[PDB]
Write a protein that holds these residues in place. Structure first.
Motif, PDB file in Angstrom:
ATOM      1  N   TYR A   1      58.394  51.005  38.856  1.00 38.99           N
ATOM      2  CA  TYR A   1      59.344  49.926  38.601  1.00 38.99           C
ATOM      3  C   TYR A   1      60.346  50.311  37.521  1.00 38.99           C
ATOM      4  O   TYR A   1      59.963  50.792  36.452  1.00 38.99           O
ATOM      5  N   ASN A   2      61.628  50.104  37.806  1.00 40.01           N
ATOM      6  CA  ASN A   2      62.658  50.227  36.783  1.00 40.01           C
ATOM      7  C   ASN A   2      62.734  48.921  36.003  1.00 40.01           C
ATOM      8  O   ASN A   2      61.967  47.996  36.265  1.00 40.01           O
ATOM      9  N   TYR A   3      63.660  48.838  35.057  1.00 38.47           N
ATOM     10  CA  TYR A   3      63.744  47.670  34.187  1.00 38.47           C
ATOM     11  C   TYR A   3      64.258  46.435  34.917  1.00 38.47           C
ATOM     12  O   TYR A   3      63.884  45.312  34.579  1.00 38.47           O
ATOM     13  N   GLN A   4      65.108  46.642  35.917  1.00 38.13           N
ATOM     14  CA  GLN A   4      65.662  45.532  36.681  1.00 38.13           C
ATOM     15  C   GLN A   4      64.557  44.832  37.467  1.00 38.13           C
ATOM     16  O   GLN A   4      64.535  43.605  37.575  1.00 38.13           O
ATOM     17  N   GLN A   5      63.636  45.625  38.004  1.00 36.95           N
ATOM     18  CA  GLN A   5      62.536  45.101  38.804  1.00 36.95           C
ATOM     19  C   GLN A   5      61.391  44.586  37.936  1.00 36.95           C
ATOM     20  O   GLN A   5      60.711  43.624  38.295  1.00 36.95           O
ATOM     21  N   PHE A   6      61.185  45.231  36.791  1.00 35.03           N
ATOM     22  CA  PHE A   6      60.012  44.976  35.963  1.00 35.03           C
ATOM     23  C   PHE A   6      60.176  43.766  35.044  1.00 35.03           C
ATOM     24  O   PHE A   6      59.244  42.979  34.881  1.00 35.03           O
ATOM     25  N   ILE A   7      61.353  43.621  34.445  1.00 31.91           N
ATOM     26  CA  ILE A   7      61.572  42.562  33.466  1.00 31.91           C
ATOM     27  C   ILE A   7      61.575  41.185  34.126  1.00 31.91           C
ATOM     28  O   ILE A   7      62.179  40.987  35.177  1.00 31.91           O
ATOM     29  N   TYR A   8      60.880  40.246  33.486  1.00 29.24           N
ATOM     30  CA  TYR A   8      60.791  38.857  33.936  1.00 29.24           C
ATOM     31  C   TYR A   8      60.145  38.714  35.316  1.00 29.24           C
ATOM     32  O   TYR A   8      60.325  37.698  35.985  1.00 29.24           O
TER      33      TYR A   8
END
Ligand code: COH
Ligand code: COH
Ligand SMILES: *[C@@H]1O[C@H](CO)[C@@H](O[C@@H]2O[C@H](CO)[C@@H](O[C@H]3O[C@H](CO)[C@@H](O)[C@H](O)[C@@H]3O)[C@H](O)[C@H]2NC(C)=O)[C@H](O)[C@H]1NC(C)=O
Ligand SMILES: *[C@@H]1O[C@H](CO)[C@@H](O[C@@H]2O[C@H](CO)[C@@H](O[C@H]3O[C@H](CO)[C@@H](O)[C@H](O)[C@@H]3O)[C@H](O)[C@H]2NC(C)=O)[C@H](O)[C@H]1NC(C)=O
Ligand SMILES: CCCCCCCCO[C@@H]1O[C@H](CO)[C@@H](O)[C@H](O)[C@H]1O
Ligand SMILES: CCCCCCCCO[C@@H]1O[C@H](CO)[C@@H](O)[C@H](O)[C@H]1O
Ligand SMILES: CCCCCCCCO[C@@H]1O[C@H](CO)[C@@H](O)[C@H](O)[C@H]1O
Ligand SMILES: CCCCCCCCO[C@@H]1O[C@H](CO)[C@@H](O)[C@H](O)[C@H]1O
Ligand SMILES: Cc1cccc(Nc2ccccc2C(=O)O)c1C
Ligand SMILES: Cc1cccc(Nc2ccccc2C(=O)O)c1C
Ligand SMILES: *[C@@H]1O[C@H](CO)[C@@H](O)[C@H](O)[C@H]1NC(C)=O
Ligand SMILES: *[C@@H]1O[C@H](CO)[C@@H](O)[C@H](O)[C@H]1NC(C)=O
Ligand SMILES: [N+]
Ligand SMILES: [N+]
Ligand SMILES: [N+]
Ligand SMILES: [N+]
Ligand SMILES: [N+]
Lengths: 551, 551
Positions: A370-377
């Motif tokens: 997971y990158n940050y766009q997918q992982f965050i929130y």
């Protein structure tokens, strides 16, 4: 203002006298003279007998065979641990002194709990330069500093082997007392407990606590998802949380800390401690069938505070320090010592704990990335894999090195910039001033700081003078200790703040440190046998192996 | 609830085990056994070598010629005074523990600053007796106790010679930390500073402070009436005060404490301290022409806090104690000792300070006689005679004796009753339990308490058992010491609370106690040479002689 040069040395207090002169107060500094620069009789001796931090650090991180012996001689281990606590805690003023608005002692600075306190006073309002007198009239562009010195190009892994269990524990734990109140400014906090009160689990206020409690058996509200216990939602509790519009309502979990929906790593620990609380309620019930919900809740909370301090010292700091000496959580070490059981969170503690270089380029759970766009929130991820898979994955994934420069993920680049800007808003003194404040020799060149040519060159072009380098940038570009996660200054400045926040807690005071405080010996034992492994084992399905370093 | 009988002795902590058993935590009590009644070996020695309070009292109140030579030997005076502080302070739990809602240790009770704290936990909710097990199911009628034991017959003077300058100083000083929040109940306080912060001068909140400050030269707002400085009006400050509709707008004085318009005695001291703050601003301005209004105000406040502590110890307590030993305000005495620089106001300290028998039948100002009808809420009386007249008159008029019973003025009768009713609201334990809590042998008979036949009979009639007697009544009817204002119990319970509130102040901590904190040696000297006489001399026209005792 003549005090703009920070003339007083060795914790001497500078005071203006008339418009053109200053007076240094050398009371109990161990020094004297106009600038408190001249050491006293007894001061020359201890200074001669004191090895450098780097020397002490080498000793504590080597001679494994020697420390194995020391670690098993209780009289010795206690004396050492006792010394670590007292010596480090002497570096912190308690009761606290300054804050962002007061570079002199005042009742407002002492009494107003909404401020972060300050280890060094702010640079006075009208000075030649922003830091006092050193450096240029304006500070370098913060965006330039991040890109040139802090922005990650190539991921540098932590040589101490810190994993994501460690990184997320750090964020989860410290965010109970780093609660910057941005509607007021960076100088202010929402953490009025100013320490380890587990408000990030139970809420900062009674009103929020009531929304989260079950009011049955002392327990906290929860959900059963896929056979396992999880936190309640905003809807069920009416306890507010910070979620972006994207996140659907049923995934809006409600926990003590309003921002913990930000990242599933935080929600993981939020879930684990929630389980722990309710688990301890069951134990206490078996111990006290006569107890009501209120005493079950309150007693459990005191247990978990104890567990937290226990784990932080004997697992978290233990790994972090890299010591072969075995640290000990034992309040009794201080009962014959001078020590203040109170704490006030320092702004500089907040700043230095911006360990975003820890963060990986992608988060790996099971076989997925997971990158940050997918992982965050994204709490869907948490529910998809479950806590057991999270723990197993995070235990295996290496964290990034904090010192050494150029290792901040681009995803959180703006956080680094804000950290610099906000420290400028709060008028922080220079990095070298903070070195001296914690009895470190100030750096004499950029090359000495970084121990390298590329960044030290960039730094010289940006600041000009070594005495103009700011606290936060210098901490992240500083030369790491041999195969260490941090450089010297991070450790030597951070350790005093940390231990003060841990042993300063009320449960460590002689009046509280009794089995009766925790519902008897069973309750007391939970604290004194707590570990990060046992925390996972008692509350995570399958009792997976875990640790703060990669296997 | 097995703990209803208060089984555990010598500070041991009682805990329920199952529905019909109890455990006593004897940790660090110096005792062991089922009820912590068996002294350890060392405990026994200490117990044998310790002189009774009535002995140390007699010694300190006699041998006048001896004390003069002690008082003039620093090493000896410092050593004595140092012991005075540490001995009493060990009797107070710091950080605090219980409150009205919590008879067990909890984070709510520790952290919630809105509660008065509790030296003894409240009686559990459902005991056989409201005091536990001892006594009748119903407590004696509040009105009868007041009438039969407390209500005044003929005015009883104070053998120690306490005047009205002393009576009103006590009310003024203590009402900065006795600020009961009757909106919430008697268990709650508005004094979140929990000590000597002088909020009764400057206001509890920053918002109220801003309304009272001049924002020029660090000074507080004021009026010049008849060529003398007085506090400002509600209308000029918008700082709300408690006044009845009758009072005219121009006599509605605004000071830190909302209630100080209730009696001219309070407004007198409010005026004097107001003058003192502005006087200190002038001094600091001369010392620091470069200082702004903010630093001038804050430094003056710290000086006045120190002034207050200096005066209270070396003049107010010095008189109340009746000691020939010269008490000393010297923070340096504790720098080598174990001591917590923090405080939490105990509810029992509030209850015991209800010294309304101090009050006269009429107030004598100059050559006139005012009763309570014409004295209360009458600020014109203050402007008529002026401060100098008030001082001269109050220095001369004798105060009533507090201990000995039957000396409470009929006007404040309902107050004395309320003090009893609220004590029951907050579930105070019995008088004898509080005796033990402060290392005093419990009274065995009603006659042993009063040392007299009439009142003891009334007590036995009302209560039956000596162990059913309540804290506040017993404190007033207790046998006064030889020609003293108080009995044994008042002094021994009160002194620890008081000294904790005084020395526990942040300015007494090593980081604060230095000349730089107070603007230099000049400011520092104002504190260290302060006295009640100097206070009046510097701020009252004519520099009238004054004292806490009638000449
Ligand atoms: C071990 C330390 C740690 C970690 C792992 C961590 C992990 C992460 C993470 C994903 C895992 C993300 C997306 C962020 C992103 C942020 N962090 Co951190 N942070 C950390 C330490 C901190 C601290 C300390 C603050 C300031 C807290 C405050 O003042 O409330 C912070 C603040 C922030 C802010 C506020 C920016 C501002 O303008 O004030 C953002 C955004 N961050 N961080
Ligand atoms: C030396 C101590 C002293 C003095 C001189 C004094 C002088 C006077 C005085 C005229 C001179 C009058 C008319 C009163 C009358 C009152 N006092 Co006092 N009081 C004193 C100690 C106290 C204390 C302590 C409280 C409780 C304060 C709180 O909780 O707010 C108090 C509270 C009160 C109350 C609150 C109502 C209640 O429910 O108790 C009244 C009315 N009173 N007192
Ligand atoms: C310190 O303890 C105080 C006493 O418990 C506490 O005050 C209490 O706070 C609760 C919650 O704010 C109030 O209950 C509320 O209940 C409903 C919601 O269900 C509200 O709509 C009501 O208006 C009410 O506010 C209690 O009434 C209140 N008790 C009082 C004032 O006596 C404080 O909140 C505690 N302090 C902190 C910082 O938590
Ligand atoms: C702790 O320090 C805080 C920062 O100084 C302080 O907040 C400040 O409070 C004042 C007064 O309450 C606010 O000023 C107010 O001024 C007008 C009146 O003219 C009001 O109508 C405004 O709404 C405004 O609230 C400051 O704005 C405020 N500063 C902030 C929030 O940054 C706290 O009050 C202090 N805490 C205590 C207990 O005193
Ligand atoms: C009071 C205990 C002192 C004993 C430990 C002595 C450690 C000696 O270590 C020496 O320290 C020097 C600087 O500290 C270094 O420059 C040397 O390289 C190192 O050999
Ligand atoms: C009692 C035995 C003393 C052993 C002390 C060994 C001192 C090792 O030397 C240390 O090595 C570090 C690099 O590894 C340097 O950064 C330190 O400055 C240096 O003091
Ligand atoms: C889960 C976070 C709290 C960890 C506290 C240690 C709990 C680990 O487990 C405990 O080990 C004990 C052995 O002494 C047993 O007595 C307990 O029954 C068992 O639950
Ligand atoms: C007003 C309450 C605090 C009193 C402080 C001391 C008051 C005595 O007065 C002071 O005496 C000093 C001499 O030692 C002088 O230096 C000061 O100018 C003088 O104001
Ligand atoms: C004793 C020791 C040694 C090395 C690091 C620490 N602690 C810290 C040092 C720097 C930053 C943070 C910490 C901490 O524990 O949070 C301690 C307490
Ligand atoms: C040393 C001593 C001796 C006797 C009385 C006191 N003080 C008090 C005793 C009872 C009640 C109040 C006080 C007080 O200082 O306010 C002290 C401090
Ligand atoms: C959140 O995670 C789920 C998997 O659990 C994934 O399908 C989804 O795309 C993620 N959300 C975003 C915005 O990437
Ligand atoms: C207040 O005092 C004045 C004298 O100073 C007196 O004339 C007046 O009657 C008093 N008020 C009351 C209500 O007694
Ligand atoms: N070094
Ligand atoms: N809330
Ligand atoms: N990303
Ligand atoms: N106000
Ligand atoms: N009256």
């Amino acid at each position: 203002n003549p005090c703009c040069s920070h003339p007083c040395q060795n914790r001497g207090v500078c005071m203006s006298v008339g418009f053109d002169q200053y007076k240094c107060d050398c009371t109990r500094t161990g020094f004297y003279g106009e600038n408190c620069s001249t050491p006293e009789f007894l001061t020359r001796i201890k200074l001669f007998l004191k090895p450098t931090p780097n020397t002490v650090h080498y000793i504590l991180t080597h001679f494994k065979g020697f420390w194995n012996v020391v670690n098993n001689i209780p009289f010795l281990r206690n004396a050492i641990m006792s010394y670590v606590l007292t010596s480090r805690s002497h570096l912190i003023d308690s009761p606290p002194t300054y804050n962002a608005d007061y570079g002199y002692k005042s009742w407002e600075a002492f009494s107003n709990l909404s401020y972060y306190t300050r280890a060094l006073p702010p640079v006075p309002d009208d000075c030649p330069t922003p830091l006092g007198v050193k450096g240029k009239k304006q500070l370098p562009d913060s965006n330039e500093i991040v890109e040139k010195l802090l922005l990650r190009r190539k991921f540098i892994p932590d040589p101490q082997g810190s994993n994501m269990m460690f990184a997320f524990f750090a964020q989860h734990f410290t965010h109970q007392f780093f609660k910057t109140d941005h509607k007021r400014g960076p100088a202010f906090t929402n953490g009025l407990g100013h320490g380890v009160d587990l408000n990030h689990i139970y809420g900062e206020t009674l009103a929020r606590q009531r929304k989260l409690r079950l009011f049955k058996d002392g327990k906290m509200k929860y959900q059963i998802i896929d056979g396992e216990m999880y936190p309640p939602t905003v809807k069920d509790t009416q306890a507010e949380m910070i979620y972006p519009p994207q996140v659907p309502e049923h995934l809006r979990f409600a926990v003590g800390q309003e921002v913990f929906g930000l990242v599933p790593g935080l929600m993981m620990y939020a879930t684990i401690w929630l389980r722990e609380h309710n688990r301890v309620c069951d134990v206490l019930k078996q111990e006290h069938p006569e107890w009501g919900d209120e005493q079950l809740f309150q007693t459990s909370r005191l247990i978990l505070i104890g567990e937290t301090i226990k784990i932080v010292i004997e697992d978290y700091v233990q790994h972090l320090s890299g010591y072969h000496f075995k640290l000990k959580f034992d309040p009794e070490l201080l009962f014959n010592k001078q020590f203040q059981y109170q704490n006030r969170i320092a702004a500089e503690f907040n700043t230095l704990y911006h360990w975003h270089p820890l963060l990986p380029d992608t988060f790996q759970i099971h076989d997925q990335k997971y990158n940050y766009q997918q992982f965050i929130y994204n709490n869907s991820i948490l529910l998809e894999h479950g806590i057991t898979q999270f723990v197993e994955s995070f235990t295996r994934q290496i964290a990034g090195r904090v010192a050494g420069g150029r290792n901040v993920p681009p995803a959180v680049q703006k956080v680094s910039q804000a950290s610099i800007d906000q420290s400028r808003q709060m008028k922080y003194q220079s990095f070298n001033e903070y070195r001296k404040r914690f009895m470190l020799k100030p750096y004499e060149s950029f090359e000495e700081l970084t121990g390298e040519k590329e960044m030290s060159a960039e730094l010289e072009a940006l600041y000009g003078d070594i005495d103009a380098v700011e606290l936060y940038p210098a901490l992240l570009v500083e030369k790491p200790r041999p195969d260490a996660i941090f450089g010297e200054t991070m450790v030597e400045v951070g350790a005093p703040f940390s231990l003060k926040g841990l042993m300063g807690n009320v449960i460590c005071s002689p009046a509280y440190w009794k089995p009766s405080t925790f519902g008897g010996e069973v309750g007391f034992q939970i604290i004194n046998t707590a570990s990060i492994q046992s925390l996972i084992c008692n509350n995570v399905k399958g009792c997976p192996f875990t640790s703060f370093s990669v296997p």
